[PDB]
Amino acid sequence: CGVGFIAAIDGKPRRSVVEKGIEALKAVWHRGAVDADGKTGDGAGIHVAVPQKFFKDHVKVIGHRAPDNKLAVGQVFLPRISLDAQEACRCIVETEILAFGYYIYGWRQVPINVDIIGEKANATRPEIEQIIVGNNKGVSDEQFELDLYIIRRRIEKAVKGEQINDFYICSLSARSIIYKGMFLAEQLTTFYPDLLDERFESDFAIYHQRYSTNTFPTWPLAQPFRMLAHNGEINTVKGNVNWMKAHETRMEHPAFGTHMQDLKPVIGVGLSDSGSLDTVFEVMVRAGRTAPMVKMMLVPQALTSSQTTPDNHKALIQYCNSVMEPWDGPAALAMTDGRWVVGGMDRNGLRPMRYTITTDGLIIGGSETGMVKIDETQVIEKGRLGPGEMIAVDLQSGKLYRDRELKDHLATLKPWDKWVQNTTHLDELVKTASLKGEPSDMDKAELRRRQQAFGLTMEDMELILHPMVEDGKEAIGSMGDDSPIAVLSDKYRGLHHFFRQNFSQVTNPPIDSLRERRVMSLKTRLGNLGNILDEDETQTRLLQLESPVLTTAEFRAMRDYMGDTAAEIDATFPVDGGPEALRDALRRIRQETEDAVRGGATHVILTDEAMGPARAAIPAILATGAVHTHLIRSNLRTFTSLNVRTAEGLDTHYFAVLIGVGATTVNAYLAQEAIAERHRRGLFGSMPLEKGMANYKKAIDDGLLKIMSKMGISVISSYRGGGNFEAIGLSRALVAEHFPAMVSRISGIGLNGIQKKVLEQHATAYNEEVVALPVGGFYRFRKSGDRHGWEGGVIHTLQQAVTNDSYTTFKKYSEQVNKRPPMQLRDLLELRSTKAPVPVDEVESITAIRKRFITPGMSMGALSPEAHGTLNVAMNRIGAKSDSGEGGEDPARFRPDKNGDNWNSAIKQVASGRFGVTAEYLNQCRELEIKVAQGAKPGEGGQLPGFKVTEMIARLRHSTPGVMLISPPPHHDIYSIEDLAQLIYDLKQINPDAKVTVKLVSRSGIGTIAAGVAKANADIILISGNSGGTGASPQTSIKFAGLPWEMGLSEVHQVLTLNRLRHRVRLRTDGGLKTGRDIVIAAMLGAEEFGIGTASLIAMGCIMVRQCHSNTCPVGVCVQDDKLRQKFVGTPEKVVNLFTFLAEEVREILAGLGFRSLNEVIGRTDLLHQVSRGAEHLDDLDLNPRLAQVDPGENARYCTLQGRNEVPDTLDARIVADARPLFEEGEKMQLAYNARNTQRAIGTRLSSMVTRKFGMFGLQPGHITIRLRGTAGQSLGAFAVQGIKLEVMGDANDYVGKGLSGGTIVVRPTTSSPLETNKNTIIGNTVLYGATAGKLFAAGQAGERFAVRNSGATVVVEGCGSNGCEYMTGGTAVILGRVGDNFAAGMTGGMAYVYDLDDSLPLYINDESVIFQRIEVGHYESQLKHLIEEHVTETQSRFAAEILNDWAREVTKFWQVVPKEMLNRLEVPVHL
């Protein structure tokens, strides 16, 4: 896994670049997916210049004459199984090339060697050939390239016309060639011996290797591509393709001519994201622009409102963002035009990219800084690439442009500043809009009648509407969702309940938003779409709004500006139309919209304003979906906009789905009317109405940003009309016809059910004489309201059965719970065998079945210490496993109590915050667990209120007492599957006895992610559902996010069985498990272990009060008081009895079924049947996708291996064989070795042995020291304890000092280095992630996210990048250099010192929660002096030495940064 590029600065061809490229490719085997075969790869490739002399000598040998001009060589993949396909494709190519007039020299068969390819990469091997085309018309180079591209496109279209499969073209150009395949990285020069020749010289080279998630290789899917190479993985392609489908219908350029007609469907079928992006990039380059300009137009920079860039770049970025929608997502790009060679990064800067210049006029860049062997007596400058940066090389003139120079050179071509001034805003327009013409308020009775028509209850106004207008933020709930799903319910559930949101597992990182809110934009532009292949002032003349949500006054001002060009459309249908009225209304509106747009209209306003006692309202979602889809399919969406006036919009989940369907702006007038009516009654107090509306809009925008950030999208323009949702319970026909791209794995109600529901509610509201709204139960149980999973009687009967220790009571409980109408997916299936029953005394005993149950993790921040300890003691008494969850654990509980009641936990979590993760915390467990996403709040981090953090929890988490703690949504360690494999390797090295468990959340597409994580040596997968509890979460994320585990579990099982991977991992599920029938169904689906969770809380005393976030739980389960902790009533015997009953129920059901063990039934799906609710409901749910049986064949249907999956040994092994006196005598040692980038986690296993022997703080500092010489790998010294000292001479790659636990690391350049130590990058990204103790001294600059989540470490580094010291909690950090934007963002504890020569810190710092001043206390001066002296002592630096020389005049050049919460608690105050 990795990209890389080598370029000769002067621009002269030579063999050196090609041989160095091959050498660099030969050393990326550690990141790839190692396999037991050793021959099976997943894709590799190189992209070089054309060796003219080679092919000219070939042609001479054949017998022709070598031409004067350059040659053209096309590489093709033809089918191999047939002999007509080959002949048909050859004929097509030859009649399509000769139609232009060029001369064909002949074909050539590339020599290959099939000795190195495995099996499954050989059954689909294509026939590789080359065609030699010469130019005889004497045309120029640009024209020749243009005709070659047109010929390639026409050949592709013609071959696709005959549906001729297995055909591909890897290149057809006169400048460059591509050698790629499905072999290992190191075996590239063995499969293709041509590259071993002496005449293959070039002036540039690009190389790439990928890491696929599945095990079925397809040769045309290997990178690099033609004029592109991509690392990372793009988020928004389902939205960008839809917008390209509208951009195609107007684009045209005189360079192509009539031939333009054969490039209309630019994005073909059967491509990945890196293919579609490549196609768009190539089209935009071939039409006049240059590679830097296209890179800026497609992947722009983050336009911030700060004074740290010249206005030139701001105008340029405004133009670029106005002309095109960005292509977001983690992306490290290495692209090349015919002239330029560019290496660039995305907006957030997630992937790493490091480069190097040598004195030979040679630049080498890649993902790792130790791939090519180069002595430091040859280097000139080392560097990196920040967020949005780029580095370019011009080969025609032979020059090297860095970031700023390239920006200044690019902002000169056109007068951008004079062009941008054509933009017009709306606040100017709303201020010129006079305070006249406002209509009179609606009547109270009319408002209530309209609200009742949509099903709005008073709890929708007192719970989720009052906090918005009162506070500026959204509501909060603290328990799982036990409500029935939308289709199985019986009340009126709006259409916006059928759409579950999306999020990102390991393959993509979610974007945190409370700290990097500067890179997220909500800009909206009307009058924007047009020709994308143009450059003129008319392209930036449009209307611009600051937010897609508009109030009523703003809507009237915008309607003023629109005026005489807009067309309004009715969206109501007659109630008496008949059984097919809604379909006819849809037809009518989607015909009128098209007939009006063709008439010159440019704005369509879709209103339901005429809703009355005889006209029901069409659901706005369906209307906008139909209209947008029809406009896209009729080549008219490019002309107009789409404005929606709705009467149901009240929650932040409505606007999200409306903008996701395709609407441009959304206006909710009924909500504003309700706000005004509630204000006139004197309910908000003394605040004006405008302040309330402003607070409501701010809360809506914040919630929209939250919803947009769960997936990884940072701009609204690329999120609109993409359909980032899933419909569960809608007909396949309806979704596939009216909605762009959503999957309905189980079809549901069609149009008749929606019409029936709408008409029923409308009649109930308008013919029935209403006087007030129902109280309604959706978040809280109400008798008049909706049904729930946990009612009162069930809980009381369960608690009684548990406390009296009687089984018949528990069977009464089971009979009560297994008799309600269906409420979940697992209620419709039915067990049915064909064998004869066997007696009860023959099945497995209760012990072997109880050891299959575990309890999920529940943090100590949420639960009380007593309940946590009770669970830990109870679960260890019966032999099962418990969980500690996030928030760490008490060290003093690490030994059995004196009743033998051991309070330890057999499962430790590695949360996203690493709040208590140390070296001892990971060596005191049997079985580990990685938590990627939680069941209740997927794509989000756990929260903890500011008053829940007592002194004990503050000490246990190494934080500040009385401070809100919100975990970061992403992981900062897991940005792609390769980083997940790296982290799994780290965890398996730090603890040599435990297993690694990955926790996911059920959704569509989880199958490929599961097949990918299974290749990363993970051995337990956990699939949580959407109905899981939580400690504190927003209500929208609780009710409108996730999917039932019935889908995800079956999908993962089938996908894992398909890839012959099921026999290596185990499956575990939880979420909503209550009885034995549920467990048996889950075991039939494929699971092997089961988690219970909330039921345990009910066995200990919790009665579902749903006030966990208030710190006032009456029983005292989730509490941190003393008054309330004294009211605990829990006992372990209760939980033991619960588990015993639950296991013996499974025994009962199995004995009645006809089996004697759970292994007899796991995976046997054919024991389940589906019966529907009857001929009176007519939901067409087909669970057959859920009951499909994939045949294993040879393998079993469960795990059959012993122990974990061991991994290859790093250098640590040798160290353990050398430092034996330290482990036997306990004496001092000193070792020296040679490091290389193919050695990961150097010094971690040694730390494990030291921890097991002496402990974290048993050895004096510097007991054992190691000296490494060379560029080290990743995770250097991760989880190092005190007493270990690593000294690297050279540089480190990434994640150096991750989770430092008291050790000491020192990084310095070589003594023979001609480099300024304060101007060259030495360490990479994410340094000191979650460290608790130790020291780290570096003699260079660090990367991005330097010292995130630092807790107790001390670091001295000569520079920093962007996002430095983000969300730091404790310790000291000295930065002797410059910093980037968003510095010290979210900092809540510690201290920082910056050394400012430029006096430009107030422009980069985030003055939100920290204060910056100058040093005024000698106590804080001795600290800095001693730290810099220690730095000088260790690294022998020269910058810091010269700073120490002139101390009196440089002490006044330092800024001191101190958090705001630490203003009372500091002990020597900072002021005078």
Ligand X SMILES: Cc1cc2nc3c(=O)[nH]c(=O)nc-3n(C[C@H](O)[C@H](O)[C@H](O)COP(=O)(O)O)c2cc1C
Contact indicator for 1135, 875 with CB cutoff of 8 Å: yes
Map the footprint of ligand X across residues 841-860, applying CB under 6 A.
856-859
**Catalytic sites, residue numbers:** 1
**Single-letter residue type at 1345:** R
Residue 224 in 3-state DSSP? coil
Partner interacting with residue 1117 (select from a copy of itself, ligand X, ligand F3S, none; CB below 5-8 Å by kind): ligand F3S
Q: Is 543 annotated as a binding residue?
A: no
Give the residue nearest to ligand F3S (CB).
1113
Nearer to ligand X, 43 or 789 (CB): 789
Nearer to a copy of itself, 1188 or 1232 (CB): 1188
Estimate the crossing angle of helix 581-597 against helix 751-766, to 10 degrees: 100
* Site for ligand X contains 480 (CB under 6 A): yes
Ramachandran angles phi, psi of 1337, nearest 5°? -120, 125
232, 885, 1034, 1330: which one binds ligand X (CB under 6 A): 885
* Site for a copy of itself contains 269 (CB under 8 A): no
The stretches of 861-999 forming alpha helices (DSSP H) are: 865-877, 919-922, 951-957, 977-990
Map the footprint of a copy of itself across residues 1158-1217, applying CB under 8 A.
1169-1172, 1174-1175
Nearer to ligand F3S, 1106 or 1269 (CB): 1106
Q: Which CA distances in Å does 548 have to 426, 649, 700, 735?
A: 12, 14, 10, 25
Nearer to a copy of itself, 66 or 773 (CB): 66
Nearer to ligand F3S, 241 or 1138 (CB): 1138
638, 934, 1035, 1456: which one binds ligand X (CB under 6 A): 934
Encoding tokens for residue 835? 């064998």
Kindly determine how many residues on this chain lie close enough to bind ligand X according to the rule CB under 6 A: 26
Partner interacting with residue 680 (select from a copy of itself, ligand X, ligand F3S, none; CB below 5-8 Å by kind): none
Q: Write out 32-74 in H/E/C secondary structure.
A: CCCCCCCCCCCCEEEEEECCHHHHHHHHHHHCCCCCCCCEEEE
* Site for a copy of itself contains 413 (CB under 8 A): no
* Widest pairwise Cα distance in the chain: 100
Nearer to ligand X, 1073 or 1181 (CB): 1073
Report the length, in residues, of the chain. 1472
- Give Cβ neighbours of residue 450 (< 8 Å, ≥ 6 apart): 611, 647, 670
- Give Cβ neighbours of residue 1186 (< 8 Å, ≥ 6 apart): 745, 746, 825, 1046, 1047, 1050
Partner interacting with residue 1073 (select from a copy of itself, ligand X, ligand F3S, none; CB below 5-8 Å by kind): ligand X
Contact indicator for 96, 148 with CB cutoff of 8 Å: no
Q: Is 317 annotated as a binding residue?
A: no
Q: What's the min distance (Å) between Cβ of 1072 and ligand X?
A: 5
**Chain centroid to CA 663: how far?**
25
Encoding tokens for residue 111? 């020599």
Nearer to a copy of itself, 79 or 1377 (CB): 79
Encoding tokens for residue 1109? 């976030």
Q: What's the min distance (Å) between Cβ of 1197 and ligand F3S?
A: 38
* Site for ligand X contains 1030 (CB under 6 A): yes
81, 99, 952, 1403: which one binds a copy of itself (CB under 8 A): 81
Q: Is 1245 annotated as a binding residue?
A: no
Partner interacting with residue 437 (select from ligand F3S, a copy of itself, ligand X, none; CB below 5-8 Å by kind): none
Q: What's the min distance (Å) between Cβ of 1124 and ligand F3S?
A: 9
62, 614, 1129, 1463: which one binds a copy of itself (CB under 8 A): 62
Q: Cα angle at 1419 between 1418 and 1420, to 5 degrees? A: 90
* Site for ligand X contains 640 (CB under 6 A): no
Other C-beta atoms closer than 10 Å to the C-beta of 323 total 17
63, 161, 563, 839: which one binds a copy of itself (CB under 8 A): 63
Partner interacting with residue 1196 (select from a copy of itself, ligand X, ligand F3S, none; CB below 5-8 Å by kind): none
* Site for a copy of itself contains 64 (CB under 8 A): yes
Q: Which secondary structure element, helix H or strand E, spans residue 910, and what is its range?
A: strand 907-910
Q: What's the min distance (Å) between Cβ of 1108 and ligand F3S?
A: 4
Residue 488 burial class via C-beta count within 10 angstroms: exposed 0-12, middle 13-18, buried 19 and up: buried
Partner interacting with residue 1115 (select from a copy of itself, ligand X, ligand F3S, none; CB below 5-8 Å by kind): ligand F3S
Contact indicator for 1422, 1463 with CB cutoff of 8 Å: no
Contact indicator for 1168, 1084 with CB cutoff of 8 Å: yes
> Measuring CA to CA, which residue among 937, 936, 878, 888 is closest to residue 910?
888
**Single-letter residue type at 81:** I
Q: Name the site residues for ligand F3S (rule: CB under 6 A).
A: 479, 1097, 1102-1108, 1113, 1115, 1117-1118
Q: Is 1085 annotated as a binding residue?
A: yes
> Measuring CA to CA, which residue among 1325, 1413, 1408 is closest to residue 1362?
1325
* Site for ligand X contains 931 (CB under 6 A): yes
Partner interacting with residue 1302 (select from a copy of itself, ligand X, ligand F3S, none; CB below 5-8 Å by kind): none
Q: Is 767 annotated as a binding residue?
A: no
**Chain centroid to CA 807: how far?**
47
Other C-beta atoms closer than 10 Å to the C-beta of 898 total 6
Distance between CA atoms of residues 1347 and 410, nearest Å: 34
Omega of the bond leading into 224 within 30 degrees of 0 (cis): yes
Nearer to ligand F3S, 668 or 1115 (CB): 1115
Partner interacting with residue 1105 (select from a copy of itself, ligand X, ligand F3S, none; CB below 5-8 Å by kind): ligand F3S
Task: Please enumerate, as own/partner, the contacts of 777-782 that have beta carbons within 8 Å and a separation of 24 or more.
Answer: 777/459, 778/457, 778/459, 778/460, 778/483, 778/1039, 779/459, 779/463, 779/477, 779/1035, 779/1039, 780/459, 780/1106
* Site for a copy of itself contains 848 (CB under 8 A): no
Contact indicator for 1318, 1377 with CB cutoff of 8 Å: yes
Query: Among the candidate windows 59-67, 275-283, 467-475, 1269-1277, which touches a copy of itself by CB under 8 A?
Result: 59-67
Partner interacting with residue 1094 (select from ligand X, a copy of itself, ligand F3S, none; CB below 5-8 Å by kind): ligand X
Query: Among the candidate windows 489-497, 1065-1073, 1135-1143, 1463-1471, which touches ligand X by CB under 6 A?
Result: 1065-1073
Map the footprint of a copy of itself across residues 1037-1066, applying CB under 8 A.
1058
Partner interacting with residue 857 (select from ligand F3S, a copy of itself, ligand X, none; CB below 5-8 Å by kind): ligand X
Q: Is 1366 annotated as a binding residue?
A: no
- Give Cβ neighbours of residue 291 (< 8 Å, ≥ 6 apart): 227, 285, 335, 336, 337, 340, 341, 342, 392
Q: What's the min distance (Å) between Cβ of 1119 and ligand F3S?
A: 7
Q: What's the min distance (Å) between Cβ of 885 and ligand X?
A: 4
* Site for a copy of itself contains 65 (CB under 8 A): yes
* Site for a copy of itself contains 1472 (CB under 8 A): no
Encoding tokens for residue 364? 């080498």
Q: Which secondary structure element, helix H or strand E, spans residue 75, and what is its range?
A: strand 71-78
Nearer to ligand X, 1042 or 1302 (CB): 1042
Q: What's the min distance (Å) between Cβ of 909 and ligand X?
A: 6
Partner interacting with residue 480 (select from a copy of itself, ligand F3S, ligand X, none; CB below 5-8 Å by kind): ligand X
Residue positions in the annotated binding site for [3Fe-4S] cluster? Answer: 1102, 1108, 1113
Binding site for ligand X (CB under 6 A): 480, 856-859, 862, 885-886, 931, 934-935, 942, 1024, 1027-1031, 1070-1073, 1093-1094, 1108, 1118
Residue positions in the annotated binding site for FMN? Answer: 1049-1106
Binding site for a copy of itself (CB under 8 A): 61-65, 81, 216, 1058, 1169-1172, 1174-1175
